[PDB]
Design a protein around this ligand. Structure first.
Ligand SMILES: COc1ccc(C(=O)Nc2ccc(Oc3ccc(N(C(=O)[C@H]4CC[C@H](C)CC4)C(C)C)c(C(=O)O)c3)cc2)cc1
Ligand SMILES: [Mg+2]
Ligand SMILES: [Mg+2]
Length: 560
């Protein structure tokens, strides 16, 4: 069927939308070419609409069915619990879109009578009505990027009302948080921290006699997901031991919300109908991960790739296997692509076999190597800094609910660019405004967290190790990419950042306390006379296990 059907009504904005990087004095110290930075708006909605609207083609085969049964067999060991309205409420982000039934996120979190009673009525409705399509809202997403040799059309987000979202958590939060790992095991990407992902990728790469790997980009994955995929996805959920009400909610949610439904713009107009994956539901990440894994695992058998190992994060996929030669590898890959195409997962960028791990990009990142103080090689996760820097520039020119720069500092703490630039720039600004102690929100694997800047040293030590504060001698390729990026965006050269860093470092030390800890560890690279970096006490008590359990992008999840 058609992923979408449109009535003609437009995808409209909720309020005024900014596209150009604002007028301010602090962003310019980060990057001078501000005209290269832009945010997507609803004005480009029609372009995305054209791209995501098409008739899907899907032909299943024995390999697909064999893998599905294998997945259900593992799903069968799971026992999911029903969340209480109170538990489900606490997971709701403070800034979650308000309900159109007289209440918002705050009321939900406060368990206000008006919110709880309506949520309860939505739940009962899910137990009684098994057919009526649930209404959703479709909006153009606002995201920041840097122009390319031009601009990207805004993506479309589709989500149900706040009440329905709370009900989703009640019935499926435990499922989407535990099942993926039980079904895919080591292949489930979100169970890893950046350091662990690298370890998994490096070990997997070293386990092959002659390794060959590739990233597979599915063209607009969400719209390639068919009604059949969503029901197959549910059949896996149904293998879990579930409470009767959870089982009915999952069944109802599947037919009423997940497989499709009517779209309404921000002005309450009927925009059309969806018959593919909605981006803003609790099962999007889990569902995409399961579906991608299922199709890829089956495609590999069809293509006859030797000893395949998948790493899947939602619609993102990387496959590492045994090489059978250059010609055979390229032929097998093309066979793989055809299999995926039949499963309704056609490629955007055609895949290409890689024989160098560092050249494989997955989750917009790649594994690279550097050296610690003692000169020992260390593997870490990095990525092209273009988007991170553009967004950091934007978040500097104006307030944003989520601080991507903080998230990028945590996930990419070992990188040459995060240390030289993001840390220096943001700590410098925080000092000036005297907000080093204020907690800021950021996202990790879609879930929202509240982080205190001054706790960064501990966090980084725990997630990356002490080597994150001593890495040097980065690879030629990594250095080239960072340098090119800085030249392109008009970002000051290393010398300027070292100077700014020395100054930030000094101010931080004179303040003592945690600030002084930030000064010693985060900026040890800026000074000539190094300081001996020993394990930080608070880094031995950090409860960071819950940070890397599952994916929640689009899930409206908040962890306090
Ligand atoms: C105007 O156009 C331009 C814009 C930008 C640039 C530019 O910055 N180019 C530009 C920026 C970075 C470059 O790579 C470097 C520089 C110093 C390093 N070193 C370090 O100790 C670093 C350790 C990590 C820490 C975070 C920084 C120091 C020493 C070897 C000297 C390392 C490394 O460790 O591999 C790598 C090269 C060119 C050049 C021109
Ligand atoms: Mg894609
Ligand atoms: Mg973990």
């Amino acid at each position: 069927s058609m992923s979408y059907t449109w009535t003609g009504a437009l995808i409209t904005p909720c309020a005024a939308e900014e596209s150009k990087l604002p007028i301010n004095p602090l962003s310019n110290s980060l990057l001078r070419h501000h005209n290269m930075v832009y945010a997507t708006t609803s004005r480009s909605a029609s372009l995305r609409q054209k791209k995501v609207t098409f008739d899907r083609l899907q032909v299943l085969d024995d390999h697909y069915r064999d893998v599905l049964k294998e997945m259900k067999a593992k799903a069968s060991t799971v026992k999911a619990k029903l969340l209480s309205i109170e538990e489900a409420c606490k997971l709701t982000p403070p800034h979650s879109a308000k309900s159109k039934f007289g209440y918002g996120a705050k009321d939900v979190r406060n368990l206000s009578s008006r919110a709880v009673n309506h949520i309860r009525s939505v739940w009962e409705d899910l137990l009684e009505d098994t057919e009526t399509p649930i209404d959703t809202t479709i909006m153009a997403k606002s995201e920041v990027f840097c122009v390319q040799p031009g601009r990207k059309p805004a993506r479309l987000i589709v989500f149900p009302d706040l009440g329905v979202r709370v009900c989703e958590k009640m019935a499926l939060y435990d499922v989407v948080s535990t099942l993926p790992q039980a079904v895919m095991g080591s292949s489930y990407g979100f169970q890893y921290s950046p350091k662990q992902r690298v370890e998994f990728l490096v070990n997997t790469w070293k386990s092959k006699k002659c390794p060959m790997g590739f990233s597979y980009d599915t063209r607009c994955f969400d719209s390639t997901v068919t009604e059949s995929d969503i029901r197959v996805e549910e059949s896996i959920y149904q293998c879990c031991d579930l409470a009767p009400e959870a089982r009915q909610a999952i069944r109802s949610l599947t037919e009423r919300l997940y497989i499709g439904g009517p779209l309404t713009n921000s002005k309450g107009q009927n925009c059309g109908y969806r018959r593919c994956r909605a981006s803003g539901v609790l099962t999007t990440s889990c569902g995409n991960t399961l579906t991608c894994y299922l199709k890829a695992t089956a495609a590999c058998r069809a293509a006859k790739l030797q000893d395949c190992t998948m790493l899947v994060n939602g619609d993102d996929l990387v496959v590492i296997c045994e090489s059978a030669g250059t010609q055979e590898d390229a032929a097998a890959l093309r066979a793989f692509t055809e299999a995926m195409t039949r499963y309704s997962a056609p490629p955007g960028d055609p895949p290409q076999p890689e024989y160098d791990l560092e050249l494989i990009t997955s989750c917009s990142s790649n594994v690279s190597v550097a050296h610690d103080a003692s000169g020992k090689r260390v593997y870490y996760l990095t990525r092209d800094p273009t988007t991170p820097l553009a967004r950091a520039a934007w978040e500097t020119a104006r307030h944003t609910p989520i601080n991507s720069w903080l998230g990028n500092i945590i996930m990419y703490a070992p990188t040459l660019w995060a240390r030289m630039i993001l840390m220096t720039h943001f700590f410098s600004i925080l000092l000036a405004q005297e907000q080093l102690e204020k907690a800021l929100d950021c996202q990790i694997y879609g879930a929202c967290y509240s982080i205190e800047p001054l706790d960064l040293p501990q966090i980084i030590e725990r997630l990356h190790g002490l080597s994150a504060f001593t890495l040097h001698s980065y690879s030629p390729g990594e250095i080239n990419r960072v340098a090119s990026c800085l030249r392109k965006l008009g970002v000051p050269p290393l010398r300027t950042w070292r100077h700014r860093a020395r100054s930030v470092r000094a101010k931080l030390l004179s303040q003592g306390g945690r600030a002084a800890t930030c000064g010693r560890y985060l900026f040890n690279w800026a000074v000539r006379t190094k300081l001996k970096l020993t394990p930080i006490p608070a880094a031995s008590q950090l409860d960071l296990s819950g940070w890397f359990v599952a994916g929640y992008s689009g899930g409206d999840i908040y962890h306090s």
